Amino acid sequence: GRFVGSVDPIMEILSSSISTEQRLTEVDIQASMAYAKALEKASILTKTELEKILSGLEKISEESSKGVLVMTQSDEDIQTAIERRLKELIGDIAGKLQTGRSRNEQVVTDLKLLLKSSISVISTHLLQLIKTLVERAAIEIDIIMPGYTHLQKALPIRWSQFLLSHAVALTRDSERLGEVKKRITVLPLGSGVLAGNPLEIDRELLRSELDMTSITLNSIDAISERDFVVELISVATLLMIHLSKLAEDLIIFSTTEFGFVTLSDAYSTGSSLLPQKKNPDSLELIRSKAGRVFGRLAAILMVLKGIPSTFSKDLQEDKEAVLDVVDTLTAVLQVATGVISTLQINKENMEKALTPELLSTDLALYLVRKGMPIRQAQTASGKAVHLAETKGITINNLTLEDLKSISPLFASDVSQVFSVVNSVEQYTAVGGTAKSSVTAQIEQLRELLKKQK
Amino acid sequence: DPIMEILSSSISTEQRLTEVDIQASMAYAKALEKASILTKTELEKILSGLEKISEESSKGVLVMTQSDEDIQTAIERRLKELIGDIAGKLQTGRSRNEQVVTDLKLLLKSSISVISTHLLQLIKTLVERAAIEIDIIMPGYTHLQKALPIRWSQFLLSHAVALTRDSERLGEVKKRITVLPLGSGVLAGNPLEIDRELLRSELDMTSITLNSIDAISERDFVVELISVATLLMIHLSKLAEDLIIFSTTEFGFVTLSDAYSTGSSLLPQKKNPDSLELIRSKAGRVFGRLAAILMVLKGIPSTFSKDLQEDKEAVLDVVDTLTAVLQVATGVISTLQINKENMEKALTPELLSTDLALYLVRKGMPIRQAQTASGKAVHLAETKGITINNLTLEDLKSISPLFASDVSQVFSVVNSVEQYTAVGGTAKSSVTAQIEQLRELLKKQ
Amino acid sequence: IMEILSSSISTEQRLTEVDIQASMAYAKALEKASILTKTELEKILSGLEKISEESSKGVLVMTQSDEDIQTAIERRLKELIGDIAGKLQTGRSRNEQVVTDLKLLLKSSISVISTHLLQLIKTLVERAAIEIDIIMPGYTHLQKALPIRWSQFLLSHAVALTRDSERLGEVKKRITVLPLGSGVLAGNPLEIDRELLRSELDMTSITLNSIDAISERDFVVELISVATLLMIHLSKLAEDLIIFSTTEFGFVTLSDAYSTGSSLLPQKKNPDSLELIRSKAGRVFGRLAAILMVLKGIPSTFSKDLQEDKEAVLDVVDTLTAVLQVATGVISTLQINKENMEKALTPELLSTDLALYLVRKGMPIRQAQTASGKAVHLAETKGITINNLTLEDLKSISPLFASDVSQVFSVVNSVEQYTAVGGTAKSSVTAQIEQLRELLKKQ
Amino acid sequence: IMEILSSSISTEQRLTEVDIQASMAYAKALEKASILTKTELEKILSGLEKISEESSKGVLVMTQSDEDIQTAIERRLKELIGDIAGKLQTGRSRNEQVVTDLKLLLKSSISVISTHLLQLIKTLVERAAIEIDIIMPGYTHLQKALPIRWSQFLLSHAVALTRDSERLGEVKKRITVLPLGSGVLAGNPLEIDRELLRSELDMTSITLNSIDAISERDFVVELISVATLLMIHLSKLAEDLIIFSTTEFGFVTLSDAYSTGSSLLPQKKNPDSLELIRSKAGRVFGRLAAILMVLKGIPSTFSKDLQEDKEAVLDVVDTLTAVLQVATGVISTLQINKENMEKALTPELLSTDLALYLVRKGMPIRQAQTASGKAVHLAETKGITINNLTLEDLKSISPLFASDVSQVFSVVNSVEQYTAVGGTAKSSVTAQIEQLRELLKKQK
């Protein structure tokens, strides 16, 4: 058994922690200032009362910034703490601010207000990462390296093509982030307990004061939905997936075995006895964070699944979940930007990784251009790799006489095929790795970034 | 090892991509003929052959073996059986890596249209019933406890706006689905200066991928579609919970048609909400697919690998499940019967104690005082063995002299509900406004 | 930035005591290996006992400078004993310390969870034994199906929780496998005595392979997994009581300690406690999904990914510990409303029993059901209830009916039919209570 | 539509046999309870075996007209025995049939999975015993750290998998708990002998409470949960080998059976199989997530939600079964490249062993490390490797260096230091091999 009485403190430690509640103090102060003005317009508050109210709130605002706004366990949430503090410096008048207002609408409002601001910060860091990748791609556009499929060397490609693939994926995340922002800016304040505000409050005034793009259409939905939370986290999860893959790419490319890249000392750790060993601690951290964010997505969906269309304590889990995601995402984008802007590419090791064999497909494409069918062209180049293989040499060292025995279509210009530059220049069609396509990609991305305003 | 095949995508799943893989092949062939890889003559045979295979596929007689491992290979073999050597030319500069991403997107493009239609139909149904039953008033809840009177229509409209946000999200996803990746080759792009713009046109796509590595290795469109489908299901799982509770005999607010429930001969009162329970459980099935694909993509190289293969089964399950659920949901909403009398009885006098407080507020009394006062009234009535709706004006004057003769208008479930005229409330004028706005958004979609 | 990207200090500080305890065992083993002299061991042992003393007054600190608790313990020793403290790190790695400390912490955490789990189960069985005579409606698809004992309902949850309890016990034995002495990856290069480490730390065994011991987090995964299913069970119990506590059903009423109200609505008792419990299932599942994704597809060695295990498992233990105590309070203080349970017991609920009666009279089930259905229909048309039909009425349906059919219309006789093991008969419920008390006797 | 949302035929068919057996057992209990005559029992049993031998040639057609396998079997029983078939349903419910059948099926499925898991484990240990002499670089953060025996690596996986085997065993105990005889929800009302049902079905025990037996799906969650952790382990092994079979690393080469190549790129060996194994971990995880979400927040009784358990758990058993066989084949047919592993061991990786040398000579570890650090730095400046330093050079750094310091530059000596239990020393690896062989044999 367990008989505590009519309180049981243990259930209090299951609610949002005070450190979390404090994060919403400012947005709750702004929301209340807007509501106060609306009340005066509805003749609930006199101009005199409004002035004492707005003054008191401003004072509390200053206290929050100084981090001296005290909150007790008895104040179960920041909304209560703020009302207590107002009564403390203004007196009874303070109680009139809650006329027709419910805690049910405060929490959703405050959370949306906080995210509107957070998305902006996230967005800023996202674009920096994209700009960093596109610009580095434009600078190292002459670098050529091996491209992979199934982590096996397939053919030569431009290192810039690799960087641009990530930039393009992150641009889609950017686009999704922008779409989510439009739905977060829908103000739910003025929905009361469930049926809406009963005092003919002017919600358009609330929207204007709070700088929101619109107001909620239905009071029941405004109070019980947490779509904005789910989307944001969902969008943040796919973004983290992208970064987890880049982290994987660089971890492999930074191995001594591959030796394509080297991380700055700022984003790695080493051993005093093994001065060559450079641990990609930063990338491993990024990769693992994809799991932390996904975990918040799974949690919130499970929380919402199957509960009635109304307000219930269940919804309380949204605060910790989103704050963790925004803080994680924010710190992660900054670290990623650092890693990419300060890493060093080893052009030497990249070329040396490009062996002649990687050009056997170009050898068949050559025949195809001479009119020969792909099937026949393929088998032809196959005999070439077999011949050189027997002659203990590479294909680029096969005389025009050796090739001539395979097919009469092999002219003198066949020597042009054995060039990593000619190889990559074949892909001029939109999206390919030719210097011209890469340049066009960089231009289109620059334009997209600009359109992120 | 034969078991390797067992872990591969099932044949019944591969057959689902026959039509789109064929359309993608015809467009490609037209592009090869322009790049002079195919003669005008070769183009005709190929196109004619693909049309024949397209016909067999529609009659369900296009056979595929385990040896063909995917539908792409089965299509090529069949073309060769119909046209001969010429068929091979169709795969010049093309890669298996780009065919699958193109086929899924082409298929998904069609699927979304279907889903959207049924989504819109479900929303229109809710909006339309809301208009018809705008005068019904039931108890409103918080924590599943009666809080205050509210209009049933306000309830229906809440689910309606949530669903419109899903509708809006589906539209945004579609824009990224229609980006053509065909022409990216194996990884570095197409090596024969193919005209990707032609492909785009021949395939009714809105644009073409900017980077070949990305276009071949990304599955954002898959995870994005499933995420949207998941939130949508969460909404339906919430609607199912509401209706299951409202359809209990204890609550008795609604009754499902025989079409969406089961019963017993020995118990006529018993009407099991099978359809609702089914809908609720599908939220988990769809979520499962979301979690599956996310875990598959986490931490793997930015290129092509066999891990990607899991996408096909996962998205078809989601689209098939979503399509069926939407129709069943529309059915349930269309044929359910509401029990006005029961909604009526549930509205007890005590539920107006708050309006009694707002009455004093409008008269100038501070909100704090009003609540206390109203709390005195609710207690006075207890110590009288009567409800508050029938307290003498003398009994009220003792609480506060502000109580006038017009205080009798508060004891009306209709006057209660009519207080909420601000945008979004239960007042008739407000509910009507919501209906008009949703009715238009529907049109604009 | 790492200021919010690294493991929090509040979590690191919780590993203080076990890290000290682990360091003391290592020191003793280092002395046996001759790396430490009898005198050096005393100095180190002495300082560590001092750091433990400080940690007993929330004194020991940390700063962003101190990446982890392992580093803070080392710093504190040095600046309290001298360079001698640096000898303690001989052949020891952080890789093995973190995985060792965590296992040491969870070992005591499981015992705490276990103690609270059993209190809940004990509370449910003892209550069932006291209210064994209460009869209420049983449901399927949330629709009334037949009469059932309320205790049978309480016991269904108690037996589910015992499977959880049993699983916690199985996880426990894999947690107490000491990984200390695995070095950076290939093991301890100083021929350290791992058996001395095990006994000092009071563990049941030691790891077999150094690579595995350093890179596996199975124990974290199965602990959270067991916790997740247990939470799924509490989420279902929460749904049941939320439904039963509505005014419409009115079977239960929560105490004021687990409910929220209002002055304007005295009849409104919000089941906050049950709503919180239900959402925590999501919270715990969230920790499961996260760790599983962190582990998926990474190389079989140490990497910074593993760092996420600490926060996730502690949130789970803290949540679980609080939730179980809250669950116990709700179950021991709630009130059942027998009057409402009885009133929900209507005659038609006995139509199935009317069929069994005929079956016992030799009639095949299929026909007995059609016969009972007719009786039901006949009662409706006459505007009465099945129990008001006359024997002549019943004989018109089947001459097999007799005067003893009147025994069928008793809610008590109805539940007393289910004497088969596990049924709702009083004798059956009594057997469940006895067996569960028996199982609870496992320490 | 309402039906295209119900489990598929091929899924329901998987339950034909176990449903048949459960019905025979119920019939016998009925007769004993005096509901069936000694004669009627014979009719029903004979008709059930006929359907059993019928599902033998796959002659039973679910028809899709039947909502589930239980219904199909009841309809098909009447079709050849007459109205007597209907008496089989006395006091029985569909609610208890579905859970009973699922458990009966999983009891046998676990056996199959178990068989393949052990074969995999045995393959790893036996190969570890055969290639015990091969040495390779060890990694942390995917950076070379120190020399290590390749067999130490293989064994780390075998030990992880032995933990999965143990968990599989504990789950079996709870799956063999018979729920038949629980009725619709209150239990069986005809005083049927459940003990008879248990022995007739070869189960370990019977459920204690009818409400729990009907609405719980713990056995489903547990199995998938165990299967998920097992797949996580295999996803890591896939990651290891994918990196090791890379050209850049070149330590491992897969057989043609588990890889794909190119006629143009004879060097191309795509690790298709491993990539396949890595993605199934997500597939299985998805089933776990789906079921946990289906069960969360629903009442403690029977409802349609519960029907999602069938497809999920079967997809999991089929996947595990296949994946383990493929995993076994990869491990048994792969080839290691001793030259590449060997030539990857650089002298630099022994700098730590140099520090240990001094520690064994009585020098404090911290000082011992700064010393090797100077040797490491001195070697660089001179443009030579650490193993090429002369006694003279070393002795200036510290007099504790002697001529025996030359032994330190042996990858063999290096790995032979870890003689403590669980280490890479040859005698430790062998000890591990012996323990697992006995642990595998214990499986009886």
Curated annotation (Swiss-Prot), chain C:
Tissue: Eye lens.
Keywords noted in UniProt: Eye lens protein
Top-level taxon of origin: Eukaryota
PANTHER family attached to this UniProt entry: ARGININOSUCCINATE LYASE
HAMAP family: Arg_succ_lyase
Family in the record: Belongs to the lyase 1 family. Argininosuccinate lyase subfamily.
GO BP annotations listed: arginine biosynthetic process via ornithine
GO molecular function terms noted in the UniProt entry: structural constituent of eye lens
Free-text function comment from the UniProt entry: Delta crystallin, the principal crystallin in embryonic lens, is found only in birds and reptiles.
Cell inner membrane recorded as keyword: no
Keyword Repeat appears in the UniProt entry: no
Subunit: Homotetramer.
Name the record gives this protein: Delta-1 crystallin
Gene Ontology CC terms: cytosol
